[PDB]
């Protein structure tokens, strides 16, 4: 468990956890909010 949590600080973590968070966030923003190309005002 300890060595596993230590292993979870490398490429297989943020760099995966990161950029997975970001791809998901961007895809969800483009899905709920379909086609933005200019701000509200």
């Amino acid at each position: 468990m300890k060595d596993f949590t230590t292993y979870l600080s490398t490429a297989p973590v943020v760099g995966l956890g990161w950029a997975i968070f970001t791809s998901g966030l961007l895809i969800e923003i483009n899905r709920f909010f379909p086609d933005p190309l200019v701000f509200s005002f």
């Binding site: 490398t10 973590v13 943020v14 086609d35 190309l37 200019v38 509200s40």
Partner: protein, 163 residues
């Protein structure tokens, strides 16, 4: 009227392009029954395409002789008009996010220079420290300007050069 461009509602080419797209969609939309899945998919696609074309034409965005939208990037032309969102506020939003990122990364890489073998911390990150600094950088303009007046970011010429 700026740059010889006209608001994008009065563009005959823009409406012709919308009609062209809708015809091209419907010609292969008529291949499926109203109950199947592909038909619903094409219906939703047409929905948000019509939504594209309707929602753009609000608060004003200029389309040219080609009918396509053209972004105005000069501050001053986005002012005295209604174009401050074309690219004027997105600039500040990206500046905010990029600040945020650089601030957090710099404070991380600095707070790691004190412990033994910092190189390890660059291949085996300090996840809780990174999470803490990630939720403390959304005031960075305040910290940056006053950390600049402070002087804790100028290195007093103690680096490796060759000349």
């Amino acid at each position: 009227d700026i740059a010889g461009l006209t608001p994008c509602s009065e563009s005959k080419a823009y409406n012709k392009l919308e009609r062209k797209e809708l015809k091209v969609l419907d010609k292969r939309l008529k291949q499926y029954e109203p109950g199947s899945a592909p038909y619903l998919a094409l219906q939703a696609t047409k929905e948000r395409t019509e939504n594209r074309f309707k929602t753009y034409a609000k608060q004003g965005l200029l389309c040219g002789n080609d009918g396509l939208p053209h972004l105005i990037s000069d501050p001053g032309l986005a002012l005295r008009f209604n174009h401050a969102g074309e690219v004027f506020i997105p600039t500040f939003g990206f500046l905010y996010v990029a600040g945020y990122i650089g601030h957090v990364g710099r404070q991380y890489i600095i707070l790691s220079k004190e412990d033994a073998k910092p190189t390890d911390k660059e291949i085996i990150l300090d996840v809780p420290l990174a999470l803490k600094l990630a939720f403390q950088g959304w005031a960075w303009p305040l910290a940056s300007i006053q950390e600049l007046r402070n002087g804790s970011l100028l290195e007093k010429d103690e680096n490796i050069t060759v000349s």
